[PDB]
Paper text:
Twelve copies of nsP1s organize into a dodecameric ring structure with the bifunctional MTase/GTase catalytic domain forming the upper ring, while the lower ring is responsible for oligomerization and membrane association. nsP1 catalyzes the 7-methylguanosine (m7G) cap (Cap-0) formation differently from the eukaryotic mRNA capping machinery: the methyl group is added to the N7 of GTP by MTase, following which the m7Gp moiety is transferred to the 5′ diphosphate end of viral RNA by GTase. We discovered that nsP1 possesses a novel decapping activity to remove mGp cap from various sources including short capped RNA and cellular mRNAs, where the resulting mRNAs bearing the 5′end diphosphates in turn will activate RIG-I–mediated immune response.
To reveal the decapping mechanism of nsP1, we determined the capping/decapping inactive mutation H37A nsP1-mut in complex with SAH and mRNA analog, Cap-1 RNA [name] at a resolution of 2.4 Å by cryo-EM. The nucleotides A1 and U2 of Cap-1 RNA, stacked on to each other, are both located in the groove between the neighboring nsP1-mut molecules. The A1 base is stabilized by the T33-P34-N35 loop and V279 of the neighboring nsP1. Compared to our reported structure of nsP1-mut in complex with Cap-0 RNA m7GpppAU-10 (12), the m7G0 cap and A1 of [name] are located at a similar position. However, the U2 base is stacked to A1 instead of binding to the distant pocket for the uridine base on the opposite side and facing the periphery of the nsP1 upper ring.
Numbering used by the authors:
A (entry chain L), B (entry chain A), C (entry chain B): 2 to 365, 376 to 414, 421 to 451, 456 to 474
Write the structure that this text describes.
Amino acid sequence: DPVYVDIDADSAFLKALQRAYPMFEVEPRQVTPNDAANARAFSHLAIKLIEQEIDPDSTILDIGSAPARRMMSDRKYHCVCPMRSAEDPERLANYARKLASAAGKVLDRNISGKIGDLQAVMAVPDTETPTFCLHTDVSCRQRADVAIYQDVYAVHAPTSLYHQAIKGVRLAYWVGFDTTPFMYNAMAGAYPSYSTNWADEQVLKAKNIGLCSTDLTEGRRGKLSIMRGKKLEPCDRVLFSVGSTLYPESRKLLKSWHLPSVFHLKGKLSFTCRCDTVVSCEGYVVKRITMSPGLYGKTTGYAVTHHADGFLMCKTTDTVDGERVSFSVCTYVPATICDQMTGILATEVTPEDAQKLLVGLNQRTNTMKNYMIPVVAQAFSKWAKECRKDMEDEKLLGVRERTWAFKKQKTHTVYKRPDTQSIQKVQAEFDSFVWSSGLSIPLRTRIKWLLSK
Amino acid sequence: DPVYVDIDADSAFLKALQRAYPMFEVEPRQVTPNDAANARAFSHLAIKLIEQEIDPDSTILDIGSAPARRMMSDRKYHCVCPMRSAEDPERLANYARKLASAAGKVLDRNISGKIGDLQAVMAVPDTETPTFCLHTDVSCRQRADVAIYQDVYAVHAPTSLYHQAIKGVRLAYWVGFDTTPFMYNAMAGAYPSYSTNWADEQVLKAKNIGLCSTDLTEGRRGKLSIMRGKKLEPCDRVLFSVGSTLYPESRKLLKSWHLPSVFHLKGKLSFTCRCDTVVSCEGYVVKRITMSPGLYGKTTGYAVTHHADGFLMCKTTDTVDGERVSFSVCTYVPATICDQMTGILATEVTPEDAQKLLVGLNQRTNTMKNYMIPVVAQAFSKWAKECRKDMEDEKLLGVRERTWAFKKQKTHTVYKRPDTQSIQKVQAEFDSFVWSSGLSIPLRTRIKWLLSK
Amino acid sequence: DPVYVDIDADSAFLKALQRAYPMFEVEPRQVTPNDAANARAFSHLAIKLIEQEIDPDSTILDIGSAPARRMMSDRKYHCVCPMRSAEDPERLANYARKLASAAGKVLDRNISGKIGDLQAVMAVPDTETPTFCLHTDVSCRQRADVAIYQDVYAVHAPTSLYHQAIKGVRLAYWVGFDTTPFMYNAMAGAYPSYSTNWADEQVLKAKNIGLCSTDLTEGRRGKLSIMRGKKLEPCDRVLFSVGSTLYPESRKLLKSWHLPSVFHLKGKLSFTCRCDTVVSCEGYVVKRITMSPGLYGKTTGYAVTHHADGFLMCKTTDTVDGERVSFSVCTYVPATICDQMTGILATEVTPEDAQKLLVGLNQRTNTMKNYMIPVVAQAFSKWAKECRKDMEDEKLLGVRERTWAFKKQKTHTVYKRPDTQSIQKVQAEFDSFVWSSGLSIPLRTRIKWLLSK
Ligand SMILES: Nc1ncnc2c1ncn2[C@@H]1O[C@H](CSCC[C@H](N)C(=O)O)[C@@H](O)[C@H]1O
Ligand SMILES: Nc1ncnc2c1ncn2[C@@H]1O[C@H](CSCC[C@H](N)C(=O)O)[C@@H](O)[C@H]1O
Ligand SMILES: Nc1ncnc2c1ncn2[C@@H]1O[C@H](CSCC[C@H](N)C(=O)O)[C@@H](O)[C@H]1O
Ligand SMILES: [Mg+2]
Ligand SMILES: [Mg+2]
Ligand SMILES: [Mg+2]
Ligand SMILES: [Zn+2]
Ligand SMILES: [Zn+2]
Ligand SMILES: [Zn+2]
């Protein structure tokens, strides 16, 4: 009945985890000093919830799986494991070591069949087995009814889902980080509760953001480069850092998982789909998607995000490789701190005064990390000024001033308070959805040797 | 079950050690007044962790070993001991004395075989034995599956790892000091928790750094030297001082162990490798490396360091041999002190006022060592000034001012706050990897005599 | 198991002794009012430690021995006792009186053999006995494996060690005062914890140092001496005063025991040696040296000293024989007092204000002796001023100003704070190492008479 998580017993993150999973009993049990403990704990509880919701005797496809995590489960899993990332050969070896070390000791699980399944694929790397295959999400031929994506960011969502549906899959799950900051087109940001920072490739030489490195210099003037950049806008390449682990991502694929509430898949076969968010905790979400045959209803093309805590996006000034520039940064703010600044923001406040007030509220144990305070104080100061300016320029009801050209005002801060919602327009009608092993002889030999005894 | 460390029972370092090794029970037991006790305690616990992680019945290679430390272990070690440093003949003699004094009293360990192995090498200094050899890491011929580097700074990392891999090694470990300050190209620095200071060879005659010596003088003017230095930049030679022990190092070899998360080794045989940091405590780290046959995935070439406490690098002014100069210095700062200065650094503060505030926070028992306070106060003062200057020179969004030449600003301080990450670009594709005994007759005779009874 | 020392039970020096020897149990037992009690207690515990570290059944050479101290030991000692100092005939008589008064009452020790050994030497003053001889460290012919130097300052270290190594000695120990202040070339200094003061011969007529004497005078003007001194620099001759005992020393021989960590001895036979400091307590140290045959590794030539408390060296003004001059003085400062002055020294302070603050911290029982306070207060005041001047003359990074001749600044104070290290360059490659009884008939007759009954 209880669930054990590898976190410290005095951690403040334990209370937030309990609030997000009211149907479990969470107990701390620390064994390792892993620096991504909070992120791993959330994903561990997410899989437990999914298994409870679905019924036994169901076949589940695990896309981009790590087979060692499913070894001690009593459900039927079919692991789809292509070898496309540099961390994959190590995961395969860890799978074989755990299997051989448990043979003859665990009897409830189908240990013998799993070992037999692995050997068959090694001899002929083209056969489908009940528990293992070497194909991709498009070229796999096994039929099931449930599909699971756990921390997968490298596929195009409408294309991948369509190939799952024509094989009889009616339910899908997606676990990962929130995609909202990438719909606002920010240049850098943070997930402070999970010790996570990300940044665009062009600003990796900044000075005062979470993920950067710079140098000491005296300051020259020439730097004669005739070719002009003249413009600095976000590009596709993005670097992620969870704890001390680095992951490169792509903006196009990240935004493709920001699906609307209702959409249609039109091809040789047609489907009507629905997307819903069931769990949310300070940047991690769980999504649930259903698919049914036929075309019903109509679509609007809107996606909605509910904010339990504050969300900020502001303009900041920094030096990149010694040159002063400006770009945008986003972050999350705890709800208690947001509610205690309502009275202060009724008037204009300087950034220096806001910083001192935030320190007093925080260090009263820290509610929020201290390295994000300076940019939050700057954002709050500009938001109050812009609100004050609006009240002093009252317009008339039901008219638009166009004396024909209109002026556009300047906006430096976007602040979504708790209990508010964001809404964006995306595509909702899809009608376009258009193999080698990759294993080497030395790797196949090594896997066989570990399995023998 | 408990682990004993040779430190004082009232030491404040005991709490930090407990937090870094949650899977053990640490108990103090002081027997000697060793002045490098904290450094020795970390290395003692690191080896215990490694043995627990790996499975028995495995062959382990100990590169650059001190065989006396492995004499009471129940695992199979193969010590690779060339004689290339002046401290090696003493280590060999200590090994023989401990073996002869334990013969006939310890039976669990393979004492008799170890004595027999040592005698065979003395007669013919070219044979490989199960527990001992006189070759280097390149010319050894024994095959194993685990390799361990404990405080080894004298080898080129990609070259050494490649020769280990072609012999069947799949796992490697490296224990030593953090290499991050040498990637920032500092001239001097400190590791205050371990009583360690280091400096470049050119600044050994300074006045107010950790490792220096100078004289008294009245001040002359001529010093007529026509040849001009005209420039002062870091060189290859670096001196280390742990407690009262001196060690010379080389900058090129130190930086070669700052490996990226993913890299390839291309030669007659090809391998794909991964590097990860598992333990970190105030500048002391443990790294884990895996190697697999074949080429998979792609590489980016980025190395990431996670900061649990503050990291600083600043410009300082001193007199070297009576002449005033300027260079850079780095150090580490405890996290609690960093969090308590957030409010103060919101405005501009003089170096004198910052020093008095730091003393009040520290001496409230000392959290940090007092001899690094003056340079920390100066570094904090310049960081606050530069942040204020950036806020008063706001630019426009998405543009670069190039009215074509751009001006570069001056930077005097780099400050990495807790819960932030550094990132550097390094090489990740390697394709180039290109014997005598050294023992003397008098030394061989002495070893034989100690072994006889 | 316990060790007894002849010091007062309420002395504050007892705590420092316990910290330096954690492996013993120290108990006070006062029997005499000796004024060099602290220095004698340290040497007593040092010999006990050495006996524990080495194994029984080993032959030990005692260079420059006092044979009465080794009379009640159960180990095998070979006392090398030439008669070259005026205190030697008295030490020999004390040896004979104790032997005759213990015959027939002590049975565990080899009392009968020691008495027989003494008589043989008197008849023929050229024979080597297992426990006694009349030669020097160069002309002795006994072979052993351990050598001990206890408060010996009258030999050249590289020459003495070479003659010990060719006789089969592999380990050596040296006990004495710290040689660091003589590497800085000071004119006078103190060891306040041991009631020890030393001074150069040229300043024995000063007024306000530890070891001096002067007269009252009204002040004349002529003193017509055509020959000009014109210069005052340290010379070879130095006087020591431990308690109320006077010892003359030589600067050349004192500096020869400041050995580097690694050095080579090259001659007919070659050796590789290593030096290490194992005990340190407020200026009193124990050194351990090992020697092995052959040539291995390379040398740098650096010697390192670790400071557990503060070390000072400053400029002072005094009248010598009525004439005002200036010279340098060194001393030691307790660590607790050093840590409490960090805040004060952030700004400029006058010598008068510094003296009052030091008195308040000290007399709050005395942590430090009051007669050294005036020179410590003056040294602190000048150090703060010089640091302030450096901050106001900032230079540029990586360049040297030589507009070609450069100016040298004035330095009046050297301050080594606790947890710092000194480093000096010394010689590390040695290749040059190039008898009468002295007893009288009346002395031999007296020794024989005391032995008979
Ligand atoms: N087109 C595709 N179809 C199926 N799997 C793919 C794929 N492209 C990449 N992958 C796999 O998806 C994996 C993402 S890494 C995720 C591993 C695992 N889910 C975990 O939580 O640790 C990679 O190992 C890669 O091999
Ligand atoms: N190329 C090489 N291959 C293998 N060992 C080497 C080597 N170059 C130097 N060494 C050895 O590496 C040692 C480093 S000193 C480290 C000793 C031991 N690991 C300890 O913890 O104390 C030296 O003794 C030197 O003999
Ligand atoms: N060249 C030499 N070789 C051996 N002994 C010498 C020597 N020159 C001087 N000595 C002896 O060294 C002694 C130093 S006095 C030290 C005595 C004794 N170790 C103690 O602690 O009391 C002198 O008595 C002198 O006789
Ligand atoms: Mg990891
Ligand atoms: Mg040592
Ligand atoms: Mg006396
Ligand atoms: Zn499949
Ligand atoms: Zn070998
Ligand atoms: Zn002799």
